[PDB]
């Protein structure tokens, strides 16, 4: 599924992301925008370590979720990666929340650092009523 902007904003809000560990809804939106274009089915294979990034947040299969085919895999979110490919993003949100409890917080995502940090992110929530 590809979310509409305000549809996704309301959904993330409903799942408790707005202000989670001090991270604004606006920044979570920018993350989803620049990881996957709001697309739950997004996948990116990394031939370098045979890992795959999954779902709207492009969560990687080496550390976070189990896809059964990534060598040296840890499953820190304790989730099947397939769970991160579903229309309902509840599981993806919980895993994203786990990611940011690590010291880097939302900086864990290099696309966020390059596309969001230090840039306008108000545009992602403007007009949504969230």
């Amino acid at each position: 599924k590809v979310f509409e902007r305000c549809e996704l904003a309301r959904t993330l809000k409903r799942l408790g992301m707005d202000g989670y560990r001090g991270i604004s809804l606006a920044n979570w939106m920018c993350l989803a925008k620049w990881e996957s274009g709001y697309n739950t089915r997004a996948t990116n294979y990394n031939a370098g370590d045979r890992s795959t990034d999954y779902g709207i947040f492009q969560i990687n299969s080496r550390y976070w979720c189990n896809d059964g085919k990534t060598p040296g895999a840890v499953n820190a979110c304790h989730l099947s990666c397939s769970a991160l490919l579903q229309d309902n993003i509840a599981d993806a949100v919980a895993c994203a929340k786990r990611v940011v409890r690590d010291p880097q917080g939302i900086r864990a995502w290099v696309a966020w650092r390059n596309r969001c940090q230090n840039r306008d992110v108000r545009q992602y929530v403007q007009g949504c009523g969230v």
Partner: nanobody
Amino acid sequence: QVQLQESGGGSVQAGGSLRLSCEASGLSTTVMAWFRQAPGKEREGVAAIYTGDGFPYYADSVKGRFTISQDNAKNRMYLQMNSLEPEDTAMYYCAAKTGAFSYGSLWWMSRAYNHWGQGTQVTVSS
């Protein structure tokens, strides 16, 4: 919990400025804000800032004139109030959250906040 301590405030003439600061102790904050209670008006969110990413919200009436910022090193948040006008006269209150916003809860809603400062008087005259 979270103890909030406000500093700054006072009297100033229109066009002038004041800097308010609020320092949090206790649980770590997710959001810190200034509210204000103007005379003969209902209380109101003025500006808010997310502790983790520094994202700010501003009330329409202070956009471009007020700047909210922070130094997490000192668990300290600042409100730089520029181009002050008589109608900015009010009691300003620091507020803080330790968790996320519930659905239906907006940054400017006092109910969204669980911790409050004691209030700081700001008087702007023509």
